[PDB]
Ligand binder design. Structure first.
Ligand code: COA
Ligand code: COA
Ligand code: NA
Lengths: 381, 616, 258, 90, 78
């Protein structure tokens, strides 16, 4: 996935690794990040509020006044926590540069309305002469920007970026930065990404449970993904596969239960018993914290698997359900299962034998039942 | 033909030792009545050799190569590579396969491949007129002809979805799991798929959905196209533009998943790396609407997908575009043994019983006791032997006695039979293990076995009530030296320290030393003849071990007799003397000792005569 | 054994036992010609207990059981089992000591060692387990690592192996430092902690297979245990089931000489 | 040994013996999976006779004698001797 | 020397073995097996001979061994 990074992190990467392809003396690493537990001062919470030309005494005045401030951005009401402090660069000119990728290569965008430069995947930047640039004002300042955007592409290409935007820049100094890293690049970027961590989107607070699942997902080729949408939500899901989990969410929203949808999750790529056990323990934990009047619903669905072993995965699911037996009865939880795939009959047998001793309703289905039929069966009845 | 990806003559390499995936491919070839397996070779980066798998109920051999160029040179007919390398190796291996002149298609299974690497693979593929299916896919299949690895799961599922014969539907999805659900949906609402491909859920695939849709448009066998997309990216807009430009004339069923997204936060990244709508155009709603407006057959929701497929298939039947097929013979493969056993379908008798240890569970057990409990309780080596050999939790004096015996018998110099043989084997340049066994194999009635004889003879005399004098007398009459009695240099005035250390410990710590009390009465009688007729080390071990067992209280007379008969005592000598044997072997290795040859003058050659060797 | 009293590396046996040197101390004298410190002698005794047995299914125990079922005496049956000890059964101990020592000596960063081994197509000896993982550890390993961490003066090669392990478990959770790896690596650390062994002396210990000897000594306990167990049970002669063998005879043409 | 008759490299035992393949021929089948020519099978049998023994003083014979003198059975004593066969003896 | 060399010649005379096949035969120790099988005869012979003679337990003579114990200082850990 593409993960957005703080302007602090992007500018730190730039001032460190860009003076390797270019003679980038023009930019220094003069950056300071202010968090909840820690001149130009602006929020660094992945936005689109900026305090320009101020003293440090005036900067501490803005910080204390805006720290913890309740603000609505994108319909989301969250508190202001992260801010960037950097030197004020007095400028006249204002140029834009952005690197994004398409199916045929990378596209460089430049403006002073916008010119586009396509860099082929196999040919690279060396195969390109920049006569495609804007001549209008780029006279004395054309060979320098040609050289800089050439270096920026090399920086984009070698540092595993999925998106970079300098909007704007002046003389060669970056003023505002927006960046996304392809998180799949992690293994190849251990040294360049050393000083950074991916931030949570504005409004959202980090989840100990979500980070625990992300931790399991990192030590396997299999997929274990969990996103809490509503902790107080009635409808909980443990769906196998990326494709199917989206479809189960579509059906719940289509029945008008978008609000009750407690989470978006996914497991696939044949995870072992231990991995599925820890995942199921996490989901069960979160759904047994609060007691709801009309109870709670757990949908253990998925398509007919190609290689994910239903016996091994459901053995992990059964083990967690056995452990949460008291908390399951007390929270009025109803379990609905629909599964197909390798050794499914053995897996459904485990779930049927469990429902006959646990003391909670467990409705068990196979490939004969339509994939998403357990959704209306649980939400309409 | 260019539009054909795989046929019944397709030969492939499976990169990565994926035994289940290999078996799945072969099982499909078998149920499809293929003449030959779809796999020419396996590429195993750790090892070259052979792999055995089934062809129905018949076992076959597949060759196994360390590298892609070596396999390609041996099997040039194989034009497909099924790549099971991890996301850390997927690029290098796919790129190497694409550089091979004989390979045309690479299916990349790995999830978590960088977007740049996928872009470079896709571009490399397009430049060389090759195909990359994936990354992050199961693959796809041509019904009744070829399957990519695990595509379409179990043989039961292949049979239930009738994938052993082609239909008229050309299917393409992003999702691997949904490709299998789609196979089931389509078989129930039409004549089934002809071919199905999952391009993967990555933002930058090796091949886009349209690449496959265009192949289906050229294929005469396919009369119907069906696809299942998702939110994020503009891939589906290649299809809608091709549909608008009349590049797709065959009826196309289309559904884009991710209708949930506008109801939830804009920050939500879904399962697949590419499943996140950055713009409004990238949403499932904008995609399904543009599909409807382009002339595709779009259902109300995923629930109605099959219904849409049924409607389009029926339309082809009315117009006579599709001809009615007769259902071919339903194929059959026996259940795998491991499945039958795991489900409890069968019961299988065990060949062996084991009562001393269990490595099956969460933790290793020694006589039913967890190893962590053995070590947390400081049971020691003697305690471990107590569990593994006697199936007892021995008292502290018994476990320490076992450890004392081991130290005492550890070595007796290089001259004794065992050490001597190990030294000769070590001097011959043999490894430690061979040299050790060469020495251990001398342990028996004359070297080490006086221990078991002293336990047996003394126990019998003392049990049957024989007075020490009567036992000494009886043995003399039979002409049998008392085992455990006698020494070459040591005597009453000059005792063997090994004996003294053992007798003193037993006298001080054993609850009972009844057989030792008897042996000392016997010893008074033998030393009254010759001073060197002392109770030796071997006698001491055998006798005190009977006393240890009598002191434990948990052994009956019979149990004790069994211990003597089975040679537990030879084992204790073997265990302890292996220390000195290993020591001697290592010592000759440190010294760089040469091959031994026994001196010629130490041998009296006494050849028989010509007359003596004759047969009458 | 020539004199008034038996000597182990020049020390009188009565002094070995009066000083409670133990089995580990006796091995220290007879194998390394050293009076080992208490933590080293106890470590040797811990390894022996840990490797004493691993159930009846492994090569060594399996062969000893078959020889016992054939009515063979204890000694023959023991050697039948001991003779399987080598590069695949027991020898990952000596390989883990050799490979980890070389990487850490030659200065290779853990990442470079992991990378080099992958390029050569060689699995790292002492790395990997079938069921145990980071979330579910092998107790045998944990018992050995915990003791070394608590009692060894130095654990430099263990510190390196744990850096290697962080990298292998980042690929697959079951790529943990196994028991064989643990013994080999900690034994180099024990020798470095003693201080009386040079780099060469340590290399000699790895090359001569002292570590195979320690495995052989400790696993003989469980081998003897299995042999006696089949004798108590009155077990019958074993014959391998016919259906577990694929008979693939060459053809008349294949056996011809040209 | 699964069938009606024991096979050595696919050849029935009765055919091996009716054809007088000899010990050299049996080794040809069981070790090289070959029906060896007469000179090759006789060479194998000649080598066996030539290496049968080299007196009691050599490592193998010496170890086998020591084990026998220790009262060990034939099989244990034999393996005690055979386990010296390696880089310097043989 | 004679056995190893003539065995390569025998294999080259058969014609059914390639250069690789011959290298494998040398590598796998087929020749150690031939020596083991033949020398088993004389090994069994000598074992039986000692049994017929009623030979006693062997102990290597003490004077054929040079005992060179390390000193107290040599066995110390530091
Ligand atoms: C792709 C897949 C087949 C890879 O198999 P795997 O079990 O993860 O692992 P591998 O066999 O490749 O081994 C993992 C690594 O451990 C290494 N390793 C193994 N044993 C080792 C040892 N003892 N010491 C060191 N390294 C070792 C291997 O060399 C390999 O290294 P690499 O990743 O750098 O090449 C598997 O992860 C999978 O099935 N993933 C699912 C993909 C998916 O969901 N796709 C979409 C379907 S729609
Ligand atoms: C007569 C002599 C040859 C006897 O030999 P020996 O060394 O004393 O002893 P033996 O070989 O007979 O053995 C002594 C006893 O120990 C017994 N014995 C030996 N090993 C034994 C064992 N392991 N357990 C039990 N008994 C054992 C023998 O059976 C024998 O018993 P016995 O005396 O009741 O028959 C010897 O004592 C001698 O030379 N004496 C000198 C006589 C003399 O001075 N004569 C005048 C010269 S002018
Ligand atoms: Na993962």
């Amino acid at each position: 996935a593409q993960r957005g990074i703080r302007e602090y992190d992007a500018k730190n990467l730039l001032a460190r690794y860009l003076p390797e392809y270019l003679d980038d003396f023009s930019y220094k690493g003069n950056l300071a990040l202010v968090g909840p537990e820690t001149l130009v001062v602006k929020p660094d919470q992945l936005f689109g509020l900026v305090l320009l030309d101020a003293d440090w005494e005036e900067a501490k005045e803005y910080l204390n006044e805006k720290m913890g401030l309740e603000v609505t951005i994108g319909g989301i009401t969250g508190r202001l926590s992260y801010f960037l402090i950097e030197p004020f660069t007095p400028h006249k000119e204002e140029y834009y540069v952005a690197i994004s990728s398409d199916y045929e290569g990378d596209n460089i965008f430049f403006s002073m309305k916008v010119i586009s430069i396509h860099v082929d995947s196999l040919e690279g930047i060396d195969a390109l002469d920049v006569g495609s640039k804007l001549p209008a004002e780029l006279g004395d300042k054309r060979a320098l920007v040609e050289e800089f955007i050439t270096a920026l592409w090399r920086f984009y290409s070698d540092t595993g970026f999925a998106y970079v935007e300098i909007n704007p820049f002046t003389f060669i100094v970056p003023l505002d930065m927006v960046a996304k890293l392809d998180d799949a690049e992690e293994y190849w970027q251990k040294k360049r990404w050393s000083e950074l961590a991916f931030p949570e989107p504005f409004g959202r607070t980090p989840s100990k449970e979500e980070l625990f699942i992300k931790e399991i997902d990192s030590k396997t080729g299999a997929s274990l993904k969990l996103t809490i949408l509503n902790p107080e939500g009635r409808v909980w899901t443990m769906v196998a596969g990326g494709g199917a989990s989206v479809i189960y969410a579509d059906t719940i929203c289509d029945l008008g239960h978008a609000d009750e949808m407690a989470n978006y999750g996914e497991y696939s790529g044949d995870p072992n018993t231990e991995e599925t056990y820890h995942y199921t323990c996490t989901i069960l934990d979160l759904m047994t914290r609060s007691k709801n009047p009309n109870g709670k619903v757990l949908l253990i669905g998925g398509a007919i698997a190609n290689f994910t072993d239903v016996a091994k995965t459901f053995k992990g699911v059964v083990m967690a359900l056995e452990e949460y037996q008291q908390k399951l009865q007390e929270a009025d939880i109803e379990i609905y299962v629909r599964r197909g795939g390798p050794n499914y009959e053995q897996g459904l047998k485990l779930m049927r034998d469990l429902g006959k001793r646990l003391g909670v309703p467990i409705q068990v289905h196979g490939p004969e039942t339509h994939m998403t039929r357990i959704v209306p069966l649980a939400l309409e009845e | 033909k260019d539009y054909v990806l795989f046929d019944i003559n397709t030969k492939a390499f499976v990169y990565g030792y994926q035994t289940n995936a290999i078996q799945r491919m072969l099982d499909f070839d078998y149920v499809c009545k293929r003449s030959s397996p779809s796999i020419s070779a396996i590429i195993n980066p750790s090892r070259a050799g052979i792999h055995k798998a089934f062809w129905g109920t018949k076992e076959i051999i597949l060759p196994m190569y360390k590298t892609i160029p070596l396999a390609a040179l041996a099997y040039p007919e194989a034009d497909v590579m099924v790549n099971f390398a991890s996301h850390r190796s997927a690029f290098e291996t796919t790129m190497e396969a694409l550089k091979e002149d004989t390979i045309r298609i690479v299916a990349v299974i790995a999830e978590g491949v960088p977007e740049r690497q996928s872009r470079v693979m896709a571009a490399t593929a397009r430049k060389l007129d090759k195909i990359v299916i994936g990354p992050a896919t199961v693959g796809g299949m041509t019904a009744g002809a070829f399957r990519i690895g695990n595509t379409a799961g179990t043989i039961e599922n292949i049979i239930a979805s009738k994938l052993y014969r082609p239909g008229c539907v050309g299917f393409v999805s992003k999702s691997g799991g949904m490709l299998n659900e789609a196979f089931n949906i389509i078989s129930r609402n039409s004549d089934g798929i002809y071919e199905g491909v999952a391009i993967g859920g990555d933002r930058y695939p090796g091949s886009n959905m349209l690449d496959h849709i265009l192949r289906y448009e050229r294929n005469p066998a396919i009369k119907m196209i069906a696809c299942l997309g998702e939110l994020g990216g503009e891939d589906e807009y290649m299809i809608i533009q091709a549909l608008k430009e009349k590049k797709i004339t065959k009826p196309l069923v289309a559904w884009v998943t991710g209708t949930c997204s506008p109801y939830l936060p804009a920050s939500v990244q879904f399962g697949h790396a590419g499943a996140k709508a950055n713009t409004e155009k990238e949403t499932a709603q904008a995609k399904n609407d543009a599909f409807r407006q382009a002339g595709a057959y779009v259902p109300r929701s995923f629930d109605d997908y099959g219904e849409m497929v049924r409607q389009v298939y029926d339309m082809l039947l009315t117009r006579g575009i599709v001809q009615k097929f007769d259902e071919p013979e339903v194929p059959r493969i026996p259940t795998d043994y491991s499945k039958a056993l795991a489900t409890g379908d069968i019961r299988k008798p065990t060949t062996f019983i084991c009562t001393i240890s269990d490595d099956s569970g969460e933790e290793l057990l020694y006589a039913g006791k967890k190893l962590s409990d053995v070590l947390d309780r400081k049971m020691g080596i003697g305690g471990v032997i107590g569990l593994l050999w006697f199936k007892k939790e021995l008292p502290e004096y018994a476990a320490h006695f076992i450890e004392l015996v081991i130290q005492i018998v550890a070595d007796h110099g290089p001259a004794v039979s065992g050490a001597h043989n190990a030294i000769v084997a070590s001097c011959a340049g043999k490894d430690l293990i061979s040299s050790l066994c060469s020495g251990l194999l001398t342990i028996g009635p004359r070297f080490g076995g006086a221990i078991d004889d002293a336990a047996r003879e003394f126990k019998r005399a003392q049990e049957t009530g024989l007075a020490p004098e009567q036992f000494v007398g009886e043995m003399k009459k039979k002409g049998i030296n008392i085992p455990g009695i006698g020494h070459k240099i040591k005597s009453v005035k000059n005792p063997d320290k090994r004996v003294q250390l053992l007798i003193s410990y037993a006298r001080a710590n054993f609850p009972s030393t009844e057989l030792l009390n008897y042996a000392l009465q016997v010893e008074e009688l033998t030393t009254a003849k010759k001073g060197n007729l002392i109770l030796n080390v071997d006698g001491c071990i055998g006798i005190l071990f009977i006393d240890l067992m009598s002191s434990c209280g948990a052994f009956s007379k019979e149990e004790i007799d069994e211990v003597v008969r089975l040679g537990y005592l030879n084992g204790l000598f073997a265990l302890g003397r292996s220390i000195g044997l290993i020591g001697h072997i290592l010592d000759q290795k440190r010294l760089g000792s040469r091959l031994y040859r026994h001196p010629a003058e130490d041998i009296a050659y006494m050849m028989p005569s010509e007359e003596e060797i004759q047969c009458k």
